[model samples]
Structures are given as structure tokens and as C-alpha cells.
Target: QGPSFPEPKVVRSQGGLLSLKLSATPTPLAIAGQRATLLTYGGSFPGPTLRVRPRDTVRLTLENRLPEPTNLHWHGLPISPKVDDPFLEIPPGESWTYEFTVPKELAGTFWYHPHLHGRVAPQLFAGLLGALVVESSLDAIPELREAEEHLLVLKDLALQGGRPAPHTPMDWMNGKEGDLVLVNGALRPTLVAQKATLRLRLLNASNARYYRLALQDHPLYLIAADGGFLEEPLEVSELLLAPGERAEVLVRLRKEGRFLLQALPYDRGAMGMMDMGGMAHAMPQGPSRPETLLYLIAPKNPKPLPLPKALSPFPTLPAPVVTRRLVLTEDMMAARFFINGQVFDHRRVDLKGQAQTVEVWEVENQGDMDHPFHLHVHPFQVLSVGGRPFPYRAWKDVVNLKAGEVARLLVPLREKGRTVFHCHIVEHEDRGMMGVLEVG
Candidate 1:
């Protein structure tokens, strides 16, 4: 209950023409004591921030106006097809365009939700979600355009009387997590700034909650990791983030008072039964009570900037004729969740792989708790995380298995037809753990 909130609205893109709308009116939210109405797009609550630059060809039209079907996922864009990618569904009031061409290495901080599979976490907890930015110039670098810049999305609501809050059965086994704690949706917000380094960016648009973020003494620096920059700059005081992930870091502000950005609590461990479509008894999980998030005043002698010796470079990767092995299972009675054991059968296609061929995918999460995997079309380069490798190489669409962990991925599909690699925790990917893979 601090930071005052309200500072996220951006929108920037002109020649790249961006236009979105997904209606559900009522709006009055800042979410603290509650007075909400929910469901939005331009109505706010994390919904407008497009921006643009690096290679810009964007277009993007989307106009579903809500009331039923929906679709639009560019979550980290890398390549596409299936007509033009983004799964196209629409259905209510209809409209969809999407041009595309922003990859000059994709700059940084990218997102745009609604993959529409079981209403995607109840319309993203009835809020939608948006924030794209591909800038990459940081105004020609110079330690990140010298300071001032904050996007901070990070959500985790689930309220009920004052708005959206329904999902228990242990939040669909263990994925819905939310007990309040938003940042751009406000509820303990506040960020005066001017004490110096600044350049936050962070996104975790949660559906399962798993951020670790910290600022107490401030020592982040990170730089970027989810899709761009980060060749050098990894100080870390603590910053984990799991669901849908995105990080930029570089804090370092505090020369004159009131500071805190906290969220330090991590323990995702035990879960015995998930027998839904089919066991029951769990808890050793931790998180849902240690949240301060933003409230950082400042204003003394701010402006230090220059703590990243080297950052940004990625373009080599192409050597893998075949390596496949999704795995990622979970069965306590068939409590549902799989990828290679099959469970998301939308007319089934499973795995074909060919288009530009260059596979290596290994992603293994023998499930017990943590599982964020995702990969539509392409964006992978983590040579290893269990069999140990990755001496250096970065390019991910999203990765985090940890439960027995594994994740190899070198993937290089050039995109032709199907694309679905799920488990970003959108309710364990709508309770099925998805899988499609069909470059053909």
C-alpha cells in the first residue's frame, strides 16, 4: 500500500502502426481496497505500451472486443507461420491483422498475451496484458541511455470481492497462485525515482507466481534475460521470476531515503496429488506473503550509470539435425499434465519437425513443482541445464523446468504450420501441458 501507482501508458509506435482493443468495460481499478470491474485492453490494468524500433514492420491489428473467442501471442516473437502465426481464433465480433518483422535480434522486453486456450487463466485474471518494446538502442547504449526508465509489469492478483478471484482446488492443483501483489496494476506501488541508475523493465505477468526480485540494498544490474541483451551484467541480489518471465534489471537507486522493492520467498517443493481429470494431498510450497514491491522515493544526488562492462550480442546458432525429447510428465492418478505422454490433443500433431530443420529440444521437467517451458516457432539456445553445457549462448523463448530439471533446446524451426510447446503455467497450460510441433 505505498507507491501511489499509475505511470504505465506509453504507446509509442507510428510508422509501425499498432492498434488493439478487447473490451469488457467498467474500469476503476488501481486494485488496493478493491472497486474493480475487470476484463480490459485499453481500459488499462497492464494493457498499453507497444513502443517499437529495431527493424519495425509491425502492423498488428487485433480487435476482438471480447465476449468469447480470442487469440494473439507474440510472447517473445522469433518466427512464425500457420498463416501468420498467433494461432488466430477471434470468434466474437472478429478482426485480426498482424503484419510482423521486428526481429533485428528482437531488441528486448516483449509480450502480448491471450493465447486463448481455456480462456487463458480466466482472461488473464480478467485483465488481458500488454507491453512490447523492441527499441534496442537504449539511445545508442552508453550504459543504457543514462538512467531513468521503468516498465515494471509484474502482476499476481486473484482478488474476489473487489474483482477477479476464483480458482481453488489449490488453484487448479498448483498454478493459479495470487494473493495480491501487483506493480503496474497497483496495490503497494510507488516509485519516485531520481536517486540514479534505474532501468528496471521486469515482466512476470503471472498466472502462477514465482518472482524473487529484491532491492533492499539494491544490486541487480542483470541487463536482460528472456530474449535480449545480457552479454555482461549479472550482479544479482536476487531475481528469479518463473511464469512467462522477462527481466532487465539495473536498479541501484538510493542516495536519500525510503527504499524497498522486495518479494524474497522461494520454496516451490511438495505436491502429491493432482488427480483432476483422474490423487490429493500437498503443501511445502512457499510464496504468498512476502511482498512489498516498490515504494522507492529517492531524490538526492541520483544518476550514476555505468555498471555494465559489456552487454548484447547473439546471432550464432545453427547445428542440430535432430535431438528431440520433450518429456515433462506428471501423473498421480492421471491428474493430467504431459507433453510426450500426450494430453493436449487439439486434433493432435505432436511432433513432425522439418521446415528449416535444426532441432535439439530436450526440455524434461519430471514434474513435482516448477515447469515453465514454452516455445512457439523458435527462439532457443540453452545447450544445457542438467547434463551441463552452455558455456555461453543465449536466446530463449522461455525456459525453467526444475523439478528434476533438464532443458537442452537448440531448436531452429523456420516456422511453417503448427506451433505449440506449452506449460507456461497457464493452469498447467489449461490442464494439459500442450504440445504440437509441426514445421513440416
Candidate 2:
């Protein structure tokens, strides 16, 4: 049977302080006998599910009770610079209120988490995150709510021996790779199905891991990518989710048995020790990669919801008039961190474009480690990778730039404001791997 979820509690924040707590509790695995700990925002996996209709006002008073100073970044929100929550870092014992009207144009499954300059990776890994679902004005998809909903917050943790991993300065210098994989903060947890069709909201919260997810016995019907619904239901054998990325997938159980959700590490040869100087300095190489993050237990008898044939289609925009090349470079000689060759100077704007102008951004990774490139204000379609067009024309806000590879994207500036483009690897951005791009 599906567990009942409590109504989401309202939070309010103001000034530069936020009042929030970071904690987790142990929960029983549905089918598996063992227990798993669910690291949650206030409590429980999936946190408190929040639903707000378009044009509604949403305010959150962030109470920072954690040992570290941190602030919240409402991913996928079109917030202005004057009240940008990402820039407001609240110290411990302080509080802040994030007040904004839910934009009438926005509708999808977004998320919120700490975006403090240097500590994002560690704080997120410790489980300070939750989801935000916005509803469209149109009729709700009944099938979406009919089936059992599962929030799979996919993450990788660098476990030492058999415990939660500790972060070190060395891990920050080089990208930290995890030894164990988790789904909703659980180690190989099980999902017992009461219905045939299941709605899975997947979130990639890992600092630098790229998950190539696949199922052992079933095909995944991808209903939405990143921010919103896809034009049609796309079937694929595997889906690759980079850091800060999200996907909504539906899977129909065909048999009354066990199935696996696996994650294969997608590592190109160039992202190896050779580029980082020595094997000893890089993440310890390992064999026997695992695929699934969770185990699925299908009920003996189940009822499936009617699957939708199509979803909301995004209109295609014109080609970009302005093109910019962002080269990823590292300053090994002076500082052991990466830079855009051009540093982020608040005074100097990186790219200026009129509202609604489509721009092509060519992101080239000259360094060895993988950097999750995230752009603010608007989401973009990944046009190509390494000179070849992406298999699926899915819209994305964050794309992974592998070593020696270049990715091209078409970005449409819908709103006028000062936004940022930076490496999602929080440490990298704080260590000078960030730049500001203003659209006015």
C-alpha cells in the first residue's frame, strides 16, 4: 500500500536570514526487510510535497539551524536580482523570507536547496532539499494523480567503510566521486507496487555524478524532461541525468515479480587520471559498476492507469542570432581551480541579448573533470554534443560538460534580469568557475 503524505507546511523568509532545519529519520523498506534512512528537509523522503497554482503567491521563511551558513536557490524560478534568493546567504541562527508571486507562465516539478557559495555540495549531500510542483491552469492530468507517485532523489555518496562520507579539501580540489549510490537517500531501497503504472519523479542531486539509468525488465516512458512535459511520450532503454537535472518517467509493470533500477557510470576515457596528472590523486578506479538505484516489487494483482498518448508540446523557436563560445580552462599554475578564462566580474556582463532573442552558447570543456554547467533565468535545448546533435531534443537548465567535449545549446531569454551561468559543482563556482550573464 502507498503511504499517506502530510500536507506541506508553509514557510516564510525575510531580509538575509532563514529559519530551517536539516534532519532525517529511519523508515521501513516496503518489500525489503532491512531499514533505510531517508535524509529529508523537515522529515521523510520527497519532503513535504508542495503544490501551488499559477499566479499564486509563495513565501518561505528559511530558518537556518544547521551548523553551516547557507541560503536557498529556487531552481527553475524566474526571480529578479533585487529579490534573488540565491544571492542571499543566511548564517546559522538567522532567517530570511523568500516572497514572490508564482509566475503565471510557469508550471512543472521544480526543486529547492541550499546554494551557498562554497558549501552547496556538502549541504545537499547531507539532505537539505525538497521538490516544488506547480500546476497549469488547464485540467489536471488525472492519470498522473491516479497512479502511485514516487520521488526518486538519485544521489551518489562517497562512503568510507560503511558510513556517510566525509568531505575534505582534496575532494573540493578535484571532483569527488562516490562509492555508493542512493535513491531517496536509501541504499538500494525497494518499492512495492499497488498499481500497475507508477509515476516516478527523478531528481539528480549528486554534486558531479552523471547517471545513465535503465531498467532490467521494462522500458521507461519518458513523460517530461527537466522543467515540463515533452511533446509526446518518448520510449527509451536508458536515460542520462546530469547533476541538477530532473525527469518524470512512467513504467508499467508487466509481471508480478522483482525489477531493478540501475545506474551505469557514463565515463568517457578523457575523464580519467591522465588529465588530472596521477591515478593516485584522482578518484579511486573501480570495476563492477552497478546499474539500478532501487528495487521494484510488483503486486500479485494490480490496476494500471491509462497512459497519456501525448503531453504539452513546446513551440520551436528561431535560430540564434548571437553565438558565444565559453571555453573551460583551469589555472593549475596559480590556483588549482577552473575559470572561464574570463572571471566573473560583477561589473562586466558576459553576454547581452534582447528579450526573446535566441542565443547559441558553445560550452567547451578543456579540463579533465566533468562540470555540470547550469544557466539561470531560462532553460535551453541541447543542440549538439561534440559536434553531433543530441539524440533527444529535450529542454534542460543544466548540462554536463565532459572533458574534451563541447556542447551547443539554444537559449531563449524570455525575461529581462541579471542571471548567472556557472558550474553547478558548487565548489567549482565558488573557486572562480562562475560568470554572470545579464539579459536586458
Candidate 3:
């Protein structure tokens, strides 16, 4: 077998505080069997794994060594906009410090990435992101704590001559999809682990790709969602993850053999469509074929750990006091997107809500492609999809809506401030599918 998959550097908090200085610059690294210069945080492709605990004060200083302005947004964290503000940009050759304390009861898989309006897609595609993990009390269980852990950062890249491919009109229209599927900055890397249970934290950092992950003859025990853990573990055969989404699952390694963790073929629309005034011919760049994401070599003597019967208690939201509707559409000829028939305007307040209030959002995608809607600073529970009740309850910040599909979300406004909610497809968000929400 080849070398084991490279693990990102882990930075843990000490004494209730985590202080680190990260430099964002273009660094040369071997990617996809070629030497390419990619933007990096602290000189690593996926940056470092931030291992922090609840109530820990995190102080991070980011030095922008790139040629353009950039900023950081803490994805899926119910943080204050004043601290995780996406509007604050640090220009080139400048540095900015972000300090925030994690909420006492919040613990799950999160991530940090560039949030600059027009530059987010390119910057993130150039590799400016990292995984942020908040340790939960469930880790104290001997079965879970003793299991082998892996942080898999899933991404896709399309390189042209050892550099990122230039975005085209069709790319913006269909949300860019890459040909190279990567896990933790490597291609088809293998992991040699003992036959014990494995705790895998999966973060989808792609700009547009959707992954339908499956392991042959193995059932995935899903334990956590984007915001936090579920009430109990649900065993499943396939897990579908959209861009900007995260999931933590436990895989019981009972077999003593090598297995390939693969992404099954998933058709996310954007295929052959009627030509609308010479828009796009066909989108053949999407991931429509099965691709191997990782390899696992099981141990000879299997000693699988037991799955937790009950992980956490997730309370149900009361009836919403307010309800709002959002419509998502795209102009094929103009290559632009809209939320509620209007493009994004930084000065316009699209919606207003009261802090600590619950609202039901009826989000409908009336376009020809899938748009993953993401809300900042708060997590929501999906009530139903396509008029059908959601199978399970999980807190999520991002939900994908298929063409002509409607999804109902029950959102609890926990923080008071101003933030933006937009399509997680960065190019679509940059193109105009975004809106601002002010909470008082």
C-alpha cells in the first residue's frame, strides 16, 4: 500500500485559551501529482485542525500576505457578527485579530473560510480554509474516546496547467464543479487503522460539489450534524453531503479487510437543458461518476467499539411566531441569481427579526439547478422537504433545495446582530443570490 493519508496539524487550546498567528499566502505544494502554488493558511492546504472546547476563548491573528483583500467567516458557529463579521476585510499586507468565546453548550464540527463577497469563490478554491472542532462531552465516553479519530476535509479542484481553472460563464451559472475529488489535500490516500471503531468528522468545503459517500458492505452510524450531535445514532448505508455541510459518523470496523470509501454517482441537475437564448450547452464537468475518496485497511484482530444508544438531547422548537417566504431563481441569459426577485445589495436589509424569537422560513428553489441555502449566526431544523416531513431532526445551517422544491425550516434567532444568508455555492452567492437579515 502507499503512504498513509496526511493528517492536518492539530492546534489545541490550553488553559481555556487558544492563541495562534496564521498567515494567508500563496505557497507551493504538490497537488494532484503536480507542483502548484495554492493559497494557504499557515502554509498548509487545509490549514490546521482547531481543537477547542466549550467556553474557550480563541484569539487568532490572520496576516494577509495575499495580493487581494480577504476575511474569515466561522461557518456553523452561532457567534456574534461583531466577532465573526464577514464585512470586515483585511487588505493585502495587513493583519487582523479575531477573538471570540465559544458558547458553553455548543460543541460540534465547524469550519472557517474566506467570506469576501466577490472573492470568496476564487480564494476558497485557491485553498484558504480550515477545520474547527469543538470538543463535546460525548468524547468522554471510553468507547468513543478510545476509537481512532479522523478529520476528513472534503474538497474538489480542477487544475489547468498546475493552476486553478479559470471560471467561465457556464461555471457561474451551474455552480463550478471540479474533476479532482480530494480528502485532506490528498488524492486517494489510504489509512491503516486498527479494527476498532472510527470517529470520522467530515466537512464538505467544496465550492459546489455534492458528495454521496458510501462504504461497501458497511453501514455508517451517523451521530452528529452540522451544528451538533443528534439525539441518537442512526445507521445508514449512504450519506449525502452538500457544500458547506458537516457530519460526524462512527464506523464500526468489524471486518478484517481493505475497503474503499467511495462517492457514488450523484446527479445534481445541470445536464442537458433547453438552450435559453444561447446560455449553456451542457454541463459535463460535474461529478457524475463514482470516485474513490479514501481507503481503509482493517486490522487483523477486530475489536469494534459499541455505538452510543443516546448521544444528546435535542429539544423541539415551539410553534413559530412569524413566518416568511424566500424564492430562489436564476436568469439564464444574464447569468445571475436572485433572492425574492432582487439581487444582493449590501445596504438593503432583506428581513428583520427579533432576537430569541422563532420563525418558520419557507424557502423554495424555482431555478433549474440545486441551491444550498445557508444562514449565518443561527442554526435551523428542517421541518419538511417537498411537503414531506423530514425523517430525522438535526440542526443545520445549510440545506440544499432541488429545482422547483420547497423546504420548510424552523429557525430560532439566538443572536442579536446583522448577518447575511445566501447560497452556499460561493459563485452563486457572489453573483447575487444573497440577502441581509437584521435582528434586534
Candidate 4:
């Protein structure tokens, strides 16, 4: 008998309140080239898009239908740790209800996934993830210039015998390499856009890879950064998206023409300031990989919309009065893995700071793989890489710290609570690359 499951669908724009039921199930996946054990959420790469307005109460019933135990982590949300229920590792045939009020301050794009200490990467790559969009109430019902908004979830798949493989220590240490790339669970799928401005929400859902995204024949107008809108639209030939990072780009399809959304691998030494050891061997370092995230197919007769020159600008906080250095060292000689020079102790808080005070954090990556360092509760601006200031200081929640490279971040602690700052690489996080922070 074959496995039974329902196809995933997008649930958006309902009535008063919204509720969702997500289940974790065992499924067969192609990792490397052969069939392997994979645990998925609702049988999709990104389970489903949970759309809701800011301040709305969301009731999520996460059912653990897999053989092992699991739980969900609401990334990038500010909620009380007491109310923010810890990982409820429900056994097979059981479920847990996650009831929480969405923070009114959250607006931009965010994501959710399993946060199990050891099985994060296997479950994540196996399809236990989804995108969450919080709509702003103040803004006018934005004109849907395009027929539909594009949600591009980028991921890398390692196939063995054209299927997924089991989790291994080596895979976690080196970051699982993939033979195929997917966008929204499609194999190089094409999307149609009306003759107008289209909003493309791009997410890097890969475990340990970074993407250098560029359009074949069109210019990309970056309208927003990770969690905030930019002061003015920035035009760039290529935009680098590290894991756990998100970008909002506006592409105007005035004339009907086909365009390709290309995701090229970042070459080794692109950022001379940082050292990403073994990254060159992990990704295809040639001209470009033969993978397309999306295909823009325009309508015959489309409406024209004016492109906005600027979006909402985030206020620049004052420079940090105190700077702290956090060393990300590795135990390569013994365990062949990386750590924060200290193990994660649930009883202790690693760092503490005052609320709304800006502090500089120097993150040094001393491992063989790149680490996407992420901070919850507060968004920050990249100050520099290897001592040089970043050209554009934009607010971000997650930034990729390359091997041997130290990334300087200006973090403005806003909400007072016990939050987390850890490597967004799920495997690395599971392997003790996480720490807790307290803002008083």
C-alpha cells in the first residue's frame, strides 16, 4: 500500500478569526538519489502559508503523526516565554494546541518550523516548515496590481537514487548539499503576472546555503529588507540571500515577456572579509547552477502601475555605547563541530542588556561551514564585515557569518524578555550552537 496524504493549499482572506491544523507525518523523500525516511508537515516543503492580521489571536493545532516526537517554534515573534509554550514533544498519535496572540508590532515576512534539539535539519529538509505573513492594519488595502502575490520559498534537496537520505553526522557538520533546488515545491515552475507591479516575497529556506539571486533580463527593485521596509528602493544586479533571510522585491511586468528568476551560488571569497571554510566544496562553484526558482509568465493584456520610489523607512537608532565580542569557535579537533565556546545550559542566560539600547555584537565564525546567526525579539543592522562598515545599513533579523569571518551587528534591544540568539542552521542549532539573551 502507498502512503496517503492530502495536497497542501493556501488558506488566505477568511472571515473574523483564523485557525489552522498542522500535522507532522512520515513520508518518503528523495535525498541524494535514494528513498529515505522524512518527516513532513502536511506533506509539503513549506507546509502552508498562515496569513493573519497583526494583533490577531491564532490557534494552531500541531498534530504529531510521525513516529517520533516534535514541536513548533514561532520564529521572530515577541511573546512571553511562559506563554510561549516550550517544545511539547508530542508522541505519535498525539497533538498540542499552540494558542498565542500575534504581536501587533509584527508586519513583514517570517517563518515557522520544528525546533527539536537533535532532529531539526532532517525534519526541516524533509518538509516540516512554512511561511507566515502578518498584514499591517494601518496600510490601505494595497492594490493587487498583479493577479496573485508570489511566495518564493527556496530550498536545496539532496537526492540519493532520486530520494531523500537519512540524517548523518557528516551531513550536519558540512551542511547537506543538494542535487536539486525547488521553489514553492515545484521543479522550475513558471508563474503568470498581469501587466503591472508584482510583489515577490523571496525566502531562503535552505539549511546551510546562500543564494545570489538575479533576474535574467529584468532589474530587481528591492523594496524591503528582512523585517522592515527600506527608505528607498535599492536596485541591484544581484542580491545575496543567506539562509533564514527574506527579501521583498518589486518587479514590474509592463510588457508581456518571459523572465527567469535565477539563483546562483555565491563563489568562495566573494566577501574577502569573511572566511567560509569548505563552502566552496559544498556548492557548485561554476558559472551558475541549472536551477530556476520561478518563471515570470506575463499576461497578454496587462495593466500598468507606477513603481514607488521609496517604501517606509526604519528610524536609525544611535550608535552603540558598548560593544561585545562573541566568539563562535569550533571543536573540530575532537567533535568536528562548532560551538559558542560554551554549551547550552537551559538554567543560565548567556548575555543580558537593557531594553531599547543599541549594542554592537562582533560574531566570529571559526568553523568549517557558514552560520546564519539569528536574533529573536530585536532586529539589527549590519555594521561591518571584517572591520569595514557595510555600504547599506538595513535592519535584519538573520545574517550569515562566514567561517573565520567576524560580522559586526548593531542590535537595538526593544522588547524586554528572555529571547534567543542562535545559528539559524537548524542542524548547527541542534548541535549546541544556540544561546539565550535577557533584555531587562
| Residue 184 C-alpha lDDT in model 4 | 71
TM-score of each: 0.34, 0.82, 0.95, 0.83
Instruction: Rank candidates, TM-score, best first.
Output: 3, 4, 2, 1
Minimal lDDT window, size 10, model 3: 277-286
Global CA lDDT of candidate 4, please?
A: 0.69
Whole-model Cα lDDT per candidate? 0.75, 0.69, 0.89, 0.69
lDDT per residue for candidate 4 within 1-440, as digits (tens), equals: 23211223666635636687888887665433345555677666567888887777778888899767777877666555444433346777898887777776666677788776677777777778788877764234353333245678888776544346566555555556566687776667667664467777788878766688988867777766787566666778888888789988777666778888887756422112223556554332333344566677766776756566455656767968678777776563233334457866656788889886889999888765567888876778887887787656457888877768899898887767776677877666767777778878
Clashing pairs in 3: none
Q: Tens digit of lDDT per residue, candidate 3, span 185-209?
A: 9998888886478989999999988
Worst 10 residues of 2 by lDDT: 24-33
By TM-score, how accurate is candidate 1?
0.34
Report the lDDT tens digits of candidate 1 across residue range 1-440.
33344656887767765544445333667567658877777688888878888776776667776778877788877756553454568888777777776766577787887887777887887778888878876446766787777888888787677778887656655777677778888877678775387887888988878878887777787777778776777787788888888888777664777888888876665353434432222434444457887788876776576676777766676688988888888763345788878888777888887877688888888877888898875877787888987544556688877788897878888768887889887877887888777777
Residues 1-440, model 2: lDDT tens digits: 26432223434323322334433232322212333343346655445545676666666666676666887777776656545645667877787777777776666677887777667767766556777776664225776666677677776765443333667655565555576676765668788778788878788877666678888878888887776777777888888787788888888887888888888767622122334545443643432265568788887776667788667767788978898889887664233454457756556677777887998999998986667888877788888989997766556788887778899999888778776788876656766677777777
Q: Backbone collision count in every prediction?
A: 4, 27, 0, 20
Estimate the lDDT of model 2. Answer: 0.69
Residue-level error in angstroms, candidate 4, position 97 = 2.2
Each model's Cα RMSD = 21.5, 5.4, 2.7, 5.5
